[PDB]
A paper describes a structure:
Protein constructs based on soluble ectodomains of HIV glycoprotein (Env) trimers are the basis of many current HIV vaccine platforms. Two-component, self-assembling nanoparticles are a versatile platform that can present HIV Env and other viral glycoproteins in a well-defined manner.. Here, we describe and comprehensively evaluate a library of de novo designed protein nanoparticles of different geometries for their ability to present trimeric Env antigens. We found three nanoparticle candidates that can stably incorporate model Env trimers on their surfaces while maintaining structure and antigenicity.
The tetrahedral nanoparticles, T33_dn2 and T33_dn10, assembled at a high yield (~80–100%) under all the conditions tested. We used cryo-electron microscopy (cryo-EM) to obtain more detailed information on the structures of the BG505-SOSIP-T33_dn10 and -I53_dn5 nanoparticles and the Env trimers they display. Due to the flexible nature of the linker between the nanoparticle component and the BG505-SOSIP trimer, the initial 3D reconstructions of the complete nanoparticles generated only highly diffuse and poorly defined density for BG505-SOSIP. The data were therefore computationally segmented to reconstruct the nanoparticle core and the displayed trimer as two independent but flexibly linked entities (sub-particles). Nanoparticle reconstruction was performed using a focused refinement procedure in which a solvent mask around the nanoparticle core excluded the signal originating from BG505-SOSIP trimers. Symmetry was applied in all 3D classification and refinement steps: tetrahedral for T33_dn10 and icosahedral for I53_dn5. The final resolutions of the reconstructed maps were 4.25 Å and 12.50 Å for T33_dn10 and I53_dn5, respectively. The T33_dn10 core design model from Rosetta Design was relaxed into the EM map using a combination of Rosetta relaxed refinement and manual refinement in Coot. There are only small, local structural differences between the Rosetta-predicted, unliganded and BG505-SOSIP-bearing models of the T33_dn10 nanoparticle core. The Cα RMSD between the experimentally determined and predicted models is 1.43 Å (on the level of the asymmetric unit), demonstrating that the presence of four displayed BG505-SOSIP trimers did not cause any major structural rearrangements within the nanoparticle core.
Author numbering:
A (entry chain B): 1 to 143
B (entry chain B): 1 to 277
C (entry chain A), D (entry chain A), E (entry chain A): 1 to 120
Write the structure that this text describes.
Amino acid sequence: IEEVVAEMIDILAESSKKSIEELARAADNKTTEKAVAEAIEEIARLATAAIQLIEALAKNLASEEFMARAISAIAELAKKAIEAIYRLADNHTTDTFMARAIAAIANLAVTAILAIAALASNHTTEEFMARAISAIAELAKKA
Amino acid sequence: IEEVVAEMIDILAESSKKSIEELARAADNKTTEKAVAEAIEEIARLATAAIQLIEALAKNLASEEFMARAISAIAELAKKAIEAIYRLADNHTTDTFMARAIAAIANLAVTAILAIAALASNHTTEEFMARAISAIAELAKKAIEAIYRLADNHTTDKFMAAAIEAIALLATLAILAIALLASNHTTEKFMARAIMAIAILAAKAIEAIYRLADNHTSPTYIEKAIEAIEKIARKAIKAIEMLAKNITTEEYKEKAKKIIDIIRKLAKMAIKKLEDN
Amino acid sequence: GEEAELAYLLGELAYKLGEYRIAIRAYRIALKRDPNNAEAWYNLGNAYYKQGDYDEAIEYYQKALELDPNNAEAWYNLGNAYYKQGDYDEAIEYYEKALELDPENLEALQNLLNAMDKQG
Amino acid sequence: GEEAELAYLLGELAYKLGEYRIAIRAYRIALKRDPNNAEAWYNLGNAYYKQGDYDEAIEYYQKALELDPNNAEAWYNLGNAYYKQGDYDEAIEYYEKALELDPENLEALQNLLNAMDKQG
Amino acid sequence: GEEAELAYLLGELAYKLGEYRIAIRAYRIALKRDPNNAEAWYNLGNAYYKQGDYDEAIEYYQKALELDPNNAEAWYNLGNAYYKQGDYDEAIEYYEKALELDPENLEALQNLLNAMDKQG
């Protein structure tokens, strides 16, 4: 059963990751400021939703090794969303929609961190806790 | 008390349903591509929110008859949101904002299915589980066909790409959601029904994917469609096997095996035809 | 005999052109004159199938198949007629037979599974 | 007889498909073999009507009607053939008869009035 | 006989509608019953011509022409069948004959010259 839940998580995570990459490419393939703004908002929106869906299922993963996978999935999505936003915003510069990029990164970082902490709050192994801590710190540092 | 919670759910559901209908009308009453895009995004956003609010309250419905009502409300909202999006997108065509329509349908289908599964995971009656399974399959089937049809009315481009992936993802998730709920069944009669629900959905997902690559005779999509078909069949079968393993009666064990072989054969034929194109 | 050949040809032409009622009348003649023409039994069954006359389609498909058991299409259509009438057990058996003869008939396979679901 | 049935069917098929000349030839056969088939007399008359062969259409419509006096359509078409030939008195009588049999035939009624005007 | 007339008519109808295979089968019957119908020999040859069955088309065109030497169209089509088979000497002779009967057949004339070039 845990595999079923975890599999749904891996599936959702892969889908989101890919959609994020596609949006980022579209924003660089396109020539307008809005293409960048749209990908930033959609990347952040999709990443947020993906994370929330994962938490929603991840909460049923009584066994820690699967929870660890769920945390990783969240962190990876958050990292890709952040990097994608960063790249588009950094390439774009010109002070246009840059505030959105900053806010989006921060919002994603918050969402991901709290989601991780929320799942992490339900387990007992010390190493796991350390991994959750590491993931949070990693995301915060990158953001 | 359950009535109070359920009433809040019925209230929210009616409100959302109506707002969805109003947005859809506005998009058809209006003359621009953006009117369609806005209704699609708002319908999906509102439907998503409504479903989430319902789950949030529905989780307190300890008594199953109310939970069943909550599931129905979610499914109905999802269906209306999907149909509304479909109609606007299908009427619109012209390859404009059509990717949004496909994604919106898929996203709603996922949201609704997982929400249903989440509520469903908390009850015990077998019939209820079967109803939850049915609702999931219903939503998945409608979403798949809506997506399929939209891609045919756009013609090739990237819409069929989106459709192939969306269908495969949706079907896979729906199957697993079914398998998960189904894992709590107590008898072969019900486990077998879950198996069949999976098999039917898998077959439909495969046919839709097959048809999109086939009717465009397009090598790009022949390759993607084949991979998607194989993926669906493998997962559908594994889900079936997981459930099949809990069947202790030969009549049903044999039925499950026949179903598995059928899925595999169907998938293989679809693949062969696409390869030949 | 020449009468049978003309009856057959008229039936076949009307059939192809969609005038199934005409084809039925002509095939009844062709078969009255020559009861062993499996093709007429088959096309007759199809002409009825096309009109929603499923009981007739079943009878005639069965005759065509007794004369020619390898007619996969007839087995398929037989299964379809049973399916349409709600007799899924029979539809299931005939879809399987059509598939043994023609494993490439995806629609029969898909319909087999659907019939299995409806029969339960 | 089978010959009559085939003749009838060929006539009917050709007729439906617009090959009225063919239909005429086939119906002559059908009637030679079986003179009582009012339907062939009627369709024969129509096949001629369609070609502008109004005298023939009249003869055959009359035969069809002697066999079946309730064929409102034949009465109507009979009236039309007379009308086309300028015999309004006859067209008038036949339009009225078609209408007695079928009061809903607006075109016959309209044509009745037009014939009345042309006859004066 | 009535049998020949029905066979002829069925052949002709199928022929007109493009179902040449059907027409062939019907014309074989029409001719078996009545070997002197030049029209059936001719249409039979055309029905085969249409299928790429040039040797058959030649045989049947020759029969039609023996019965009716003035059928310019048959001479033309005979020449075309020979042409298609690479026998330009024969195509040339038949195009010339079709032209003697019908000097207005530009296509036969053009084909005559083309055949002359291919024969060398």
